[PDB]
Design a protein around this ligand. Sequence first.
Ligand SMILES: Nc1ncnc2c1ncn2[C@H]1C[C@H](O)[C@@H](COP(=O)(O)OP(=O)(O)OP(=O)(O)O)O1
Ligand SMILES: [Mg+2]
Ligand SMILES: [Mg+2]
Length: 511
Amino acid sequence: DPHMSKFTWKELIQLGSPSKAYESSLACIAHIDMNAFFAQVEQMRCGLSKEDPVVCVQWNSIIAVSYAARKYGISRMDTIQEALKKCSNLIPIHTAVFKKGEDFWQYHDGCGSWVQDPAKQISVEDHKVSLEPYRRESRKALAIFKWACDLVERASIDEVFLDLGRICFNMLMFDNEYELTGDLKLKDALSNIREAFIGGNYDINSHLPLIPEKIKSLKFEGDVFNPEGRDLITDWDDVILALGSQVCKGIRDSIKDILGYTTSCGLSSTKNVCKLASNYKKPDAQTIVKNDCLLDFLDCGKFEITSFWTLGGVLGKELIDVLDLPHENSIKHIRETWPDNAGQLKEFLDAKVKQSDYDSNIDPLKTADLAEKLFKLSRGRYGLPLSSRPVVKSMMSNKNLRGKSCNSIVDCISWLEVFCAELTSRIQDLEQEYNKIVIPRTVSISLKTKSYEVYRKSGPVAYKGINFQSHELLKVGIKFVTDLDIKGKNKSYYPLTKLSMTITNFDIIDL
DNA sequence: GTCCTCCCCTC
DNA sequence: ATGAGGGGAGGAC
Ligand SMILES: Nc1ncnc2c1ncn2[C@H]1C[C@H](O)[C@@H](COP(=O)(O)OP(=O)(O)OP(=O)(O)O)O1
Ligand SMILES: [Mg+2]
Ligand SMILES: [Mg+2]
């Protein structure tokens, strides 16, 4: 019915449910990604400004580039020597490090390969990186996000997704302060819907009324992606999104004011679109993608089907082959080739997979799910839930090895001693920060030989308290690296090119 | 039944 | 041939 909203009371009320809000076409999701994260951490640590051309350096490689340094054309994975040729007043700052034979990390500021002084080097042969300064700042940011929002997913060290559904719903129905104009409050613009909601006499399966003309005074905060100049507020999804944009700016301002960090952000009805949108404009910006602008956005020329999370690897390339996708404008191609329903794409996939001479990363028993995923992704309507993650899931300590710096079992164990110190300190920090007992249950050793062959072993680790944790980790590590040395007998083995220890499973006890 | 090994995904 | 981490399949146990 064109006399009513596209959306229902069910879809609106669902915003108030953390378990179901993501399923709604009215969902308001944010993806927030810290700008030049490791470079901003170093900037803040060293009392420097947004205008200072800071780069974070790991060995000889630039792993994060401040937006000031980007103005000189410096890019991630430039070597420090390449970057110094682009910017005469560059401020390179090496990551903190552990020294082999020691059990703590520190910064050696004023030290690095770019420094002439032979006494101020950080040798790759006898140090490993500590990323703990970045992890600590990430956890501080997470605490701020969780204070602001009831459902926050930490997606990686500098990314979160927020479900703004409760905040948006509550603002829509209950906020009696918010002003649209100097003459018009939100409460008065939304008098009809609030009357219905408080009155309680709606049917959940009824469509909402068409939006009131007065709510069109509501502003979006940020950059609304809108190359076709579509009307900004035309249905309740736009109302929810605009309210979300206002809230989202407030949350990002809290991060900036408290921690000093700028962020980029994407706002839309789905996690996948949010993640694309947060990368669209940087630094210090939020890009908003209206439902009516989803195809405009997806088809802007920046994106392909391989841009979507899970599809950037071998499954994505397989789908390009199987579905006969073009090298460009693949998203539109998917949309237009199976234009009516996901069943059209399912039929096509089923025929391809049923062929006797097929194989693959496609599950032949789950083609319905794959078809629906692709159909919806190509329209910007594939809604995945947010997961609130545990305090920790895994912890890894890794050293890729050069030359002969791991040339025997003695060297392996020397590196394991650093790994065990590092992991134990990380566990202790988490226990204190979160008031938990954090208990490693399973450990994995993974290593690569001189010929790049991978050897791995995993198994249980015993628990005897935090004061014996490093010892219990090392016991198992020693057992595993000696076991693997035997397995490598009479084969290309030493000197190793990689050694790592990962705690892959933890028990977390609440206190 | 769960564990171990290999593998794919992302920044 | 360049340190994290999330996650699942399936044969081993
Ligand atoms: N391939 C990588 N290897 C090691 N560290 C990485 C890699 N990619 C990114 N990082 C680290 C450094 C980054 O500051 C941090 C967050 O990554 P990411 O958000 O992609 O870049 P960024 O925060 O430096 O820039 P942007 O402003 O584009 O977000 O993770
Ligand atoms: Mg970032
Ligand atoms: Mg990232």
